[PDB]
Design a protein around this nucleic acid. Sequence first.
RNA 1: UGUGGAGGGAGCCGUCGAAGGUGGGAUCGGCGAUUGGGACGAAGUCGUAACAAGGUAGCCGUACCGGAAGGUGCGGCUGGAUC
Length: 32
Amino acid sequence: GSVIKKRRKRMSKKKHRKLLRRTRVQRRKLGK
RNA sequence: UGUGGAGGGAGCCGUCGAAGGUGGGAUCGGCGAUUGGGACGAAGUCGUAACAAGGUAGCCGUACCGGAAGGUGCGGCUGGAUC
């Protein structure tokens, strides 16, 4: 088993997560 | 025998009636000032996060935080090394 794969996975996950932290307001108070 | 009679038609009325209109909706596309992140880039800036115990072992899930890689906490795994 390697960890390169899991790391690329992890990075995509993290960037999407931080994007959601930054847009937690706009998503809610836009898409109603 | 007579403008007689059935009877029929014209004509008219009603049912159904396409197209035309009104109506608020569905669905499908396009545009959209601005805003995202995605790929590639020549060559550059910021750092050293990772690979050897990568110099704080990494990694999974989650929460918080941070200029950025990332850091810390709780639990877990070895796909973790020496003795």
